[PDB]
């Protein structure tokens, strides 16, 4: 269909691995040809996970005959069982494993695994990595979670975080700090830190908190229906959104909406004579839909940036994005290829391209200030420092990370403007 | 427990599915009224909403993913928690090409697994066309509905043989040919003996149930039921007889061309 | 049998497109191989690379002829956008093999339809046949049949090596009284070297197994010479080549005397941290034994397990002959046992795969991440102490951080 | 010859309309070739008393050969000289739905019965209107829309009209008007036809008189009952007179915006 050199999302099985390795005691036994191991490298190196990603690969080098591949998958299931001792097993098929005729769950049941085995369907040719993560989450919630008694203290569930997320670690620290400072405890952050036991306990929290909608929204809906746990909707990225999120979780839990804004530096700093040059700067906004909508609110309100184009790479969340874009006077640019993004930036000629890894590079080729506000990123954008995005400290981060490229440009452009690079023009009266 | 509600008439066999949904909602179990009949008359008879939205054509959005939520396409309306109607894109609505439209297939691959108590499967309107027999893939307790008209009972027998045709691997059972006769026709009785099927809740008519109008409602939600309790009588019992396939009267349809029973 | 960690052969494309320019690689497959190229290239993809994935959606799954027509359309579109292409490559991938979408007949279909200037060739980096470096092997081996023949003693050392090092090698080697070297002066055009009965090819990178077979099919003559990685490897390689081409050793001793001195001095300077450290040569790239002989002898190392995905003893026997037969080899690859052997043996330096590198380093193991040596210059004299340096790096970093 | 696309919803008056319209075509003295698609074999069987063997009947007795499709057996000639063929729907599960009727038409043309006759009245189903199922519409020149008089049936005829516009891709098939399956004199459809830019020919209700599945074994034109009156049959006679002169070919437009008034 197309020559894809840049693909924002990855294959569905990669998202399934995100969820699997996010958990503690969950093996993702995956049917896959020899070589499809490469994603373990992504997890090991980009995110720098000490322990190897707890996923196995029934690599069929050249016994592609269904009799053989089934045996490899079965053997790998059982081997992953008594090797890594997981409390539950995740089994699915990837790419050619979908092409090869296998019963990805029937065999897993047939081996009579005492630990629960969650059967996964991942259509490897019409879906993407965000879907895959969300669906794997839905599956583990169905299998493991079960309605039980509400905890005595209102417990909020941090639904959504997974591994290899955009700052899915500092961010949950920040959100937990805000929530517990208001008083609500967290029952079990479900992925990016939740044993299958934690998922078993997901039915005791009062009200869910959908941290990252894209990877976890379907689990949130299932929670609302089965577990009867209402889930919040607003993502607290920024200050305005953070206040709204605080009020919303207060209402869902019936508590006071106290906010520790003593850390809030971004409002005051943006409202400073030092940085009034920001007003009237077109910013192009790309990346996954949640982060883009939140960045839209921040750029338009907190910073006074005039947003020129909002696009996303996940079609699954297009409708909210087109709603928002019609809000901001623009039209959404939901796409999947880097070409249309390059064209949109070229035509609109922004001055601050907040976007995914590829938008960063598009910026650098075009000489426009760049920043990263989304999921597709290499190892560099996964920092060691405390760099959340939601919460008040997230607002501070947002401020500095977004302003830093513009300041780089300004002091760069100054050093050019300065006489060291400007002793080339002269005028003598009437020439 | 998928209950494919077959038949010939438009408003017939479609009011019936809504009555099944109402009875099963009274029974409490979640119900999946997927109508998708070309006549916007399947979710109408249960919700009262004649044509809420036809998004199952997916024109405003290009493909399935765009609907981050089911709320746009699926609808609740009344106790029928899931009343959704595809409508079909024939030459009547848009271009169409084949009258398949594969909309039944779109509901097959719709969104995420909203399983609940499987599906009640109003569905249908395909009956037969080579390559336009999609609903057969999820049919599990397919039931054919007929009025007194001989064309309609022929429609039954044809459908039963046709479902046995494709259900070479699906092997859908048919617990009974619940009908929609109006005048207690003994010809349909002789047929039910001939087809060796089960038809107990077939007294539902097109005249006795407020003439099967399109302004009022069905079963519990409409005014004072029907003839005090006539509507409930056959339909609560249907939700206590066919509520599962515990009585699999599934035979071989017509044993040997037992259609030449025109009489008069 | 078991979990194999080696990547698909498409990882060959990553350096193949740079080394053999004017060559586009259509890796027809799924989004999965697309992602693999994405991640592996890392920063190349931004620099307008010469590869890409022709994704097979469900639409292009059942109808093989439909997929063929769409692929022809895609190819025409690419060559229109990339007129500079001289040899397109229809490299198959695992989905492509499963769909049995024969790209050979497709290459026949679109050979000269959109211009005879694009010589479309077909190989297969699919993980279902090749293993990592077997990609470049397969690519060049499919190159071989299209190559012309020759009627002179021609030195066909296979050009899978960085142009700077290649220029160094050809300079010294021609200095050793040798003529045709498959060194196209500009190196920016299709080399099209002649392969005849008197053609003599010298294997340069070990992974090129089926290339050896292909040249043997073309009547070419192999050189059983130790591979030019370190000091003895490069020395024996040059000496062997000099003999077989007909050159004496008298001029050779003077030609590369200074290079030999630099190689030995640099290795002695970089192996200071490398003093009897145990090396577990995990099977990752089938390149291991050639590095091993260097380490164990002239670096002063102690090999434990010099494994390999595949073993081509026909071209490995020379290199192994210098290897001390103590250290065992491995034809059986499964992380389920490889990691256990590593953990039990406690080797001080292990060449794990990248996905195993960080985990293994977390278990008190200095891991030499192996993806470099294929990609970084580690060949010949000037770049032997360099190789020893990358090997001494992990232990020195461990030393600093305790 | 003079060909009309008669598309029935599937109502019981399919026989009463097709067979008796054809009978009147012959009553005025003209050669008839009725194509009544009714796998139950009722739409045309009454002109001969017994169940007529169509193209499909003999083409079923033989496997795939037309030389044993003899005239009287592959198109049964009915009363008053009505040689009326049928279309027996595909065997349950297998066989393209179109294939059957397509082969009926192709066999009628193979012996050149349409040229042999002066009538080609073309009664085909209107409930399933897939490309193959709606293929018979293309062959006919004019079109009359036989139907019951209720809102289920008005939706059915709008589906028929949609199939007509779909087959309008091929040639320039027109629509003579709309009639009923002996149900009502277009009191429930005429304003709808006006809505779709069409006319519904005022076909007098004939279901009011005594009716059976196909009026026992012979319909109103083939038995002594003769509906109510010879004028009740003169209704079909005047329809036949219109079908020679073929007035009002005007093609309606599809109406999917709840104009059915279900
Ligand atoms: C986790 C997947 C990943 C990423 C994002 C890249 C790019 C990149 N990989 Mg390495 N790298 C991964 C895989 C691969 N890299 C590839 C390329 C390449 C090499 C040769 C090199 C490298 C390295 C890296 C780097 C620098 C950060 C790092 O991963 O350590 C990126 C962004 C880089 C480095 O780490 O050493 C200084 C180094 O020199 N990549 C290839 C060859 C096909 C592989 C298997
Ligand atoms: S036979 Fe198949 S292709 Fe033809 S109209 Fe019917 S469904 Fe469409």
What is the DSSP track for D117-174?
Answer: SSEEEEEEESS---TTTTTHHHH-SEEEE---SSHHHHHHHHHHHHHHHHHTTSTT--
Tell me how far apart the alpha carbons of residues A188 and C204 are, in angstroms, rounded to a whole number: 56
- Do D84 and D34 form a contact (C-beta atoms < 8 A)? yes
Instruction: Using alpha carbons, select from A196, A193, A192, A108 the residue that is nearest to residue A144.
Output: A196
Tell me how far apart the alpha carbons of residues C354 and C368 are, in angstroms, rounded to a whole number: 9
Tokens 């998928």: give the residue: B2
- Do C237 and C226 form a contact (C-beta atoms < 8 A)? yes
> Which two structure tokens, joined as six digits, stand for A366?
């075009």
Beta strands in chain D (DSSP E): 2-8, 34-36, 76-78, 82-86, 119-125, 142-145, 177-178
Q: Is C94 annotated as a binding residue?
A: yes
Interface residue A231 vs chain B (CB under 8 A): no
Based on C-alpha coordinates, what's the Rg of chain C? 22
Based on C-alpha coordinates, what's the Rg of chain A? 24
Inter-chain contact C58–A1, Cβ cutoff 8 Å? no
CA distances from A325 to A331, A332, B58 (A): 5, 5, 21
At residue C216, φ and ψ (nearest 5 deg) are -60, -35
> Which two structure tokens, joined as six digits, stand for C353?
């795969």
Strand partners, C200: C155, C221
Question: Strand, helix or coil at A210?
Answer: strand
Q: What residues contact C325, with CB distance under 8 A and at least 6 apart?
A: none
> Which two structure tokens, joined as six digits, stand for A193?
């830190």
Tell me how far apart the alpha carbons of residues C329 and C308 are, in angstroms, rounded to a whole number: 7
Using alpha carbons only, give the angle A180, A181, A185 rounded to the nearest 5 degrees: 15
Strand partners, D143: D5
Tokens 């009722």: give the residue: D42
Other Cβ atoms less than 10 A from the Cβ of A408: the count is 12
Q: Calculate how close chain C gets to A421, using CA atoms only, in Å.
A: 29
This structure was determined by cryo-EM
Q: Tell which atom from ligand 2 comes closest to the C-alpha of B97.
A: 8
DSSP string, B194-230: HHT---GGG---SSTTGGG-SSS--GGGSTTTTTTTH
Q: Which of B37, B41, B122, B126 is an active site residue?
A: B126
- Do A235 and A211 form a contact (C-beta atoms < 8 A)? yes
Buried b (16+ CB within 10 A) or exposed e, C124-136: bbbbbbbbbbbbb
* Residue B98 alpha carbon to ligand 2 centre in Å: 6
Could you write out the three-class secondary structure of chain C?
CCCCCCCCCCHHHHHHHHHCCCEEEEEEECHHHHHHHHHHHCCHHHHCCCEEEEECCCHHHHCHHHHHHHHHHHHHHHHHHCCCCCEEEEEECHHHHHCCCCHHHHHHHCCCCCCCCCCCECCECCCCCCCCCHHHHHHHHHHHHHCCCCCCCCECCCCCCCHHHHHHHHHHHHHCCCCCCCCCCCCCCCCCCCCCCCCEEECCCCCCHHHHHHHHHCCCEEECCCCCCCCHHHHHHHHHHHHHHCCCCHHHHHHCHHHHHHHHHHHHHHCCCCCCCEEECCCCCCCHHHHHHHHHHHHCCEECEEECCCCCHHHHHHHHHHCCCCCEEECCCCHHHHHHHHHHHCCCEECCCHHHHHHHHHCCCEECCCHHHHHCCCCCCCCCHHHHHHHHHHHHHHHHHC
Other Cβ atoms less than 10 A from the Cβ of C92: the count is 30
Tokens 């109510």: give the residue: D228
Tell me how far apart the alpha carbons of residues C393 and C270 are, in angstroms, rounded to a whole number: 9
Q: What residues contact A19, with CB distance under 8 A and at least 6 apart?
A: A90, A133, A136, A137, A140, A162, A163, A191, A215
Q: Which conformational region is residue C33 in: left (phi greater than 0), alpha (psi within -120 to 50 degrees), or beta?
A: alpha
Report the interhelical angle of C31-41 vs C11-19 (nearest 10°): 60
Distance from first CA to last CA of chain A, Å, rounded?
61
- Do C342 and C272 form a contact (C-beta atoms < 8 A)? no
Please give the distance of CA D259 from its chain centroid, rounded to a whole number. Answer: 25
DSSP string, B141-210: B-EE---SSHHHHHHHHHHHHHHHHHTTTS--B--------SS--HHHHHHHHHHT---GGG---SSTTG
Tell me how far apart the alpha carbons of residues C316 and A62 are, in angstroms, rounded to a whole number: 24
Resolution (A): 3.7
Q: What residues contact C278, with CB distance under 8 A and at least 6 apart?
A: C302, C304, C345, C346, C347, C348, C349
Going by DSSP bridges, is the β-strand pair D82-86/D76-78 parallel, antiparallel, or unpaired?
A: antiparallel
> Which two structure tokens, joined as six digits, stand for C6?
């080696």
H helices present in A215-265, as ranges: 217-222, 240-253
Strand partners, C26: C52, C90
Going by DSSP bridges, is the β-strand pair A3-4/C51-55 parallel, antiparallel, or unpaired?
A: antiparallel
> Which two structure tokens, joined as six digits, stand for B205?
């008519």
In total, chain D counts a number of residues equal to 262
CA distances from C259 to A113, B73, C157, C177, C382 (A): 62, 75, 20, 17, 7
Report the interhelical angle of C134-146 vs C209-217 (nearest 10°): 20
* Residue C168 alpha carbon to ligand 1 centre in Å: 27
- Do C159 and C191 form a contact (C-beta atoms < 8 A)? yes
Based on C-alpha coordinates, what's the Rg of chain B? 18
Q: Which conformational region is residue A289 in: left (phi greater than 0), alpha (psi within -120 to 50 degrees), or beta?
A: alpha
Mutation site for C-interface testing, chosen from A62, A66, A95 by largest number of C Cβ within 10 Å: A95
In total, chain B counts a number of residues equal to 264
> Which two structure tokens, joined as six digits, stand for C139?
């690519």
CA distances from A48 to A285, A357, C42, C332, C370 (A): 28, 18, 16, 28, 17
Q: Calculate how close chain B gets to A161, using CA atoms only, in Å.
A: 18
Q: B–C contact (≥3 CB pairs within 8 Å)?
A: no
Instruction: Using alpha carbons, select from D127, D148, D124, D149 the residue that is nearest to residue D138.
Output: D124
Going by DSSP bridges, is the β-strand pair A55-57/A88-93 parallel, antiparallel, or unpaired?
A: unpaired
Contacts of residue B39 in chain D, CB cutoff 8 Å?
152, 155, 260, 262
Tell me how far apart the alpha carbons of residues A90 and A84 are, in angstroms, rounded to a whole number: 13
Based on C-alpha coordinates, what's the Rg of chain D? 17
Strand partners, A306: A282
Question: Strand, helix or coil at A203?
Answer: coil
Q: Is A42 in the pocket of ligand 1 (CB under 6 A)?
A: yes
Q: Which of D9, D38, D141, D167 is an active site residue?
A: D9
- Do A91 and A117 form a contact (C-beta atoms < 8 A)? yes
Tell me how far apart the alpha carbons of residues A354 and A406 are, in angstroms, rounded to a whole number: 11
Catalytic annotation present for B105: no
Tell me how far apart the alpha carbons of residues D128 and D159 are, in angstroms, rounded to a whole number: 9
- Do A395 and A264 form a contact (C-beta atoms < 8 A)? yes
Tell me how far apart the alpha carbons of residues C398 and B112 are, in angstroms, rounded to a whole number: 50
CA distances from A256 to A248, A253, B61 (A): 11, 9, 41
Going by DSSP bridges, is the β-strand pair C349-350/C302-303 parallel, antiparallel, or unpaired?
A: unpaired
CA distances from B11 to B14, C326, D149 (A): 5, 86, 14
- Do A270 and A395 form a contact (C-beta atoms < 8 A)? no
Strand partners, D124: D7
Tell me how far apart the alpha carbons of residues A168 and A21 are, in angstroms, rounded to a whole number: 13
Contacts of residue B62 in chain A, CB cutoff 8 Å?
315
> Which two structure tokens, joined as six digits, stand for D237?
């006679």
Distance from first CA to last CA of chain B, Å, rounded?
37
Interface residue B58 vs chain A (CB under 8 A): no
Strand partners, C24: C88
Tell me how far apart the alpha carbons of residues D60 and A298 are, in angstroms, rounded to a whole number: 74
Tell me how far apart the alpha carbons of residues A178 and A162 are, in angstroms, rounded to a whole number: 20
> Which two structure tokens, joined as six digits, stand for A26?
């969950």
Q: Which ligand is nearest to the CA of C46?
A: 1
Inter-chain contact B68–A138, Cβ cutoff 8 Å? no
Tell me how far apart the alpha carbons of residues B34 and B109 are, in angstroms, rounded to a whole number: 13
Contacts of residue A125 in chain C, CB cutoff 8 Å?
30-31, 56-58, 61
Tell me how far apart the alpha carbons of residues C143 and C214 are, in angstroms, rounded to a whole number: 9
Q: Calculate how close chain A gets to B113, using CA atoms only, in Å.
A: 9
Q: Which of D61, D115, D127, D152 is an active site residue?
A: D127
Inter-chain contact B69–A315, Cβ cutoff 8 Å? no
Catalytic annotation present for D257: no
Other Cβ atoms less than 10 A from the Cβ of B250: the count is 21
Tell me how far apart the alpha carbons of residues D209 and D231 are, in angstroms, rounded to a whole number: 13
Buried b (16+ CB within 10 A) or exposed e, C178-193: bebbbbeeeeeebeeb
> Which two structure tokens, joined as six digits, stand for A101?
């005729």
Tell me how far apart the alpha carbons of residues B37 and B33 are, in angstroms, rounded to a whole number: 11
Q: Which ligand is nearest to the CA of B91?
A: 2
Q: D–C contact (≥3 CB pairs within 8 Å)?
A: no
| Kind and range of the H or E run holding A172 | helix A170-182
Tokens 């008694």: give the residue: A149
């Amino acid at each position: 269909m197309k020559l894809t050199l840049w693909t924002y999302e990855g294959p569905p099985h990669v998202g399934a691995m995100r969820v699997a390795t996010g958990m503690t005691g969950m093996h993702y036994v995956l049917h896959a040809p020899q070589g499809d191991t490469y994603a373990d490298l992504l997890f090991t190196m980009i995110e720098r996970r000490g322990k190897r990603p707890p996923v196995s690969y029934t690599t069929f080098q050249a016994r592609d005959l269904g009799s053989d591949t089934a045996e490899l998958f079965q053997s790998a299931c059982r081997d992953a069982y008594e090797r890594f001792q997981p409390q539950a097993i995740m089994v699915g098929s990837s790419c050619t494993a979908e092409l090869i005729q296998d019963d990805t769950g029937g065999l897993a049941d047939a081996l009579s695994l005492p630990v629960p085995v969650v059967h996964l369907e991942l259509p490897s040719y019409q879906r993407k990595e965000n879907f895959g993560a969300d669906e794997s989450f839905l599956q583990i919630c169905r299998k493991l979670a079960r309605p039980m008694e509400r905890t005595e203290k209102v417990s909020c569930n941090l639904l959504g975080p997974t591994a290899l997320g955009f700052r899915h670690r500092d961010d949950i620290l920040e959100v937990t700090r805000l929530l517990e400072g208001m008083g609500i405890a967290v029952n079990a952050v479900a992925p990016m830190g939740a044993s299958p036991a934690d998922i078993a306990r997901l039915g005791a929290a009062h009200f869910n908190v959908l941290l990252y909608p894209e990877t976890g929204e379907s689990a949130a809906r299932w929670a609302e229906k089965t577990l009867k746990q209402p889930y919040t909707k607003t993502v607290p990225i920024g200050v305005g959104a953070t206040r709204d999120f605080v009020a919303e979780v207060a209402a869902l839990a019936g508590v006071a909406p106290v906010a520790d804004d003593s850390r809030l530096r971004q409002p005051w700093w943006s409202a400073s004579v030092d940085s009034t040059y920001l007003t009237g700067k077109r910013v192009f906004l790309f990346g996954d839909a949640t982060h883009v909508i939140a960045a839209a609110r921040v750029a338009r309100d907190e910073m006074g940036f005039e947003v020129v184009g909002m696009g996303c790479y996940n079609r699954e969340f297009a409708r909210p994005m087109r709603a928002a874009a019609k809000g901001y006077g623009l039209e959404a640019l939901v796409t999947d290829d880097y070409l249309e993004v390059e064209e949109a930036i070229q035509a609109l000629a922004p001055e601050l391209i907040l976007g995914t890894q590829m938008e960063r590079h598009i910026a650098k080729r075009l000489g426009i200030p760049c920043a990263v506000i989304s999921a597709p990123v290499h190892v560099q954008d996964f920092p060691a420092r405390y760099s959340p995005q939601m919460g008040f400290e997230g607002a501070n981060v947002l401020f500095d990370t977004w302003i830093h490229p513009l300041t780089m440009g300004l002091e760069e452009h100054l050093l050019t403007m300065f006489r060291e690079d400007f002793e080339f023009h002269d005028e003598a009266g009437p020439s | 427990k998928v209950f494919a509600v077959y038949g010939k008439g438009g408003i017939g066999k479609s009011t019936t599915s809504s009555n099944l949904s109402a009875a099963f909602s009274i029974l409490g179990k979640r119900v999946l009224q997927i109508g998708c009949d070309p006549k916007h008359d399947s979710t109408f008879t249960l919700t009262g909403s004649l044509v809420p939205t036809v998004i199952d054509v997916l024109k405003d959005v290009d493909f399935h993913p765009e609907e981050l939520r089911p709320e746009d396409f699926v609808f609740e309306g009344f106790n029928g928690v899931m009343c959704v109607e595809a409508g079909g894109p024939p030459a009547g609505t848009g271009c169409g090409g084949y009258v398949v439209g594969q909309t039944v297939k779109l509901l097959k691959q719709h969104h995420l697994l909203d399983d609940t108590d499987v599906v009640i499967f109003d569905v249908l309107g395909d009956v037969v066309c080579g390559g336009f027999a999609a609903p057969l893939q999820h049919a599990d307790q397919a039931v054919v509905v007929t009025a007194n008209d001989f064309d309609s009972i022929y429609a039954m027998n044809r459908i039963i043989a046709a479902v046995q045709a494709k259900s070479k691997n699906y092997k859908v059972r048919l617990a009974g040919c619940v009908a929609n006769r109006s005048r207690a026709t003994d010809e349909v009785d002789r047929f039910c003996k001939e087809t060796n099927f089960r038809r107990l809740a077939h007294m539902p008519d097109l005249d006795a149930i407020r003439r099967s109008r399109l302004k009022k409602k069905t079963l519990f939600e409409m005014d004072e039921d029907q003839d005090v309790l006539a509507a409930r009588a056959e339909y609560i019992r249907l939700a206590e007889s066919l509520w599962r396939g515990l009585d699999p009267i599934d035979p071989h349809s017509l044993p040997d061309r037992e259609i030449f029973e025109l009489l008069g | 049998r078991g979990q194999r960690e080696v990547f698909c052969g498409l990882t060959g494309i990553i350096w193949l497109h740079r080394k053999m320019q004017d060559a586009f690689f259509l890796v027809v497959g799924s989004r999965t191989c697309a992602h693999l190229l994405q991640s592996a290239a890392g920063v190349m993809i931004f620099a307008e690379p010469r590869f890409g994935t022709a994704v097979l959606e469900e639409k292009d799954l059942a109808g093989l002829a439909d997929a063929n027509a769409e692929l022809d359309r895609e190819v025409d579109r690419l060559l229109a956008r990339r007129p500079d292409i001289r040899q397109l490559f229809l490299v198959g991938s695992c989905p492509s093999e499963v769909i049995k979408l024969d790209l050979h007949r497709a290459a026949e279909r679109l050979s000269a339809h959109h211009g005879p200037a694009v010589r479309v060739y077909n190989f297969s980096g699919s993980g279902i046949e090749t293993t990592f470096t077997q990609g470049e092997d397969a690519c060049l081996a499919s190159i071989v049949p299209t190559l012309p023949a020759t009627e002179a003693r021609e030195l066909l050392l296979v050009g899978a090596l960085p142009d700077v090092v290649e220029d160094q090698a050809v300079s010294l080697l021609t200095q050793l009284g040798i003529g045709p070297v498959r060194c196209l002066p500009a190196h920016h055009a299709a080399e099209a070297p002649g392969v005849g009965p008197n053609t003599v090819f010298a294997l340069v990178q070990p992974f090129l197994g089926d290339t050896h077979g292909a040249l043997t099919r073309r009547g070419a003559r192999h050189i059983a010479a130790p591979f030019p990685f370190g000091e003895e490897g490069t020395t024996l390689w040059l000496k062997a080549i000099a003999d077989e081409f007909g050159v004496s050793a008298e001029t050779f001793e003077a030609v590369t005397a200074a290079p030999r001195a630099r190689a030995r001095k640099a290795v002695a300077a970089a192996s200071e941290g490398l003093r009897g450290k145990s090396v577990f040569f995990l099977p990752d790239s089938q390149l291991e034994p050639s590095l091993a002989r260097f380490l164990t002898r002239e670096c002063g190392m102690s090999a434990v397990e010099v494994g390999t995905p595949f073993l081509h003893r026909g071209i490995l026997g020379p290199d192994l002959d210098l290897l001390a037969e103590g250290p065992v080899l491995s034809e059986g690859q499964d992380v389920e046992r490889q990691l256990d052997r590593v953990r039990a043996a406690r080797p001080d330096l292990t060449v794990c795969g990248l996905g195993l590198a960080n985990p293994l380093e977390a278990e008190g193991f200095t891991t030499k991440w192996a993806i470099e040596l294929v990609f970084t210059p580690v060949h010949f004299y000037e770049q032997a102490g360099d190789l020893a340096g990358l090997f001494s790096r992990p232990v020195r970093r461990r030393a600093i951080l305790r």
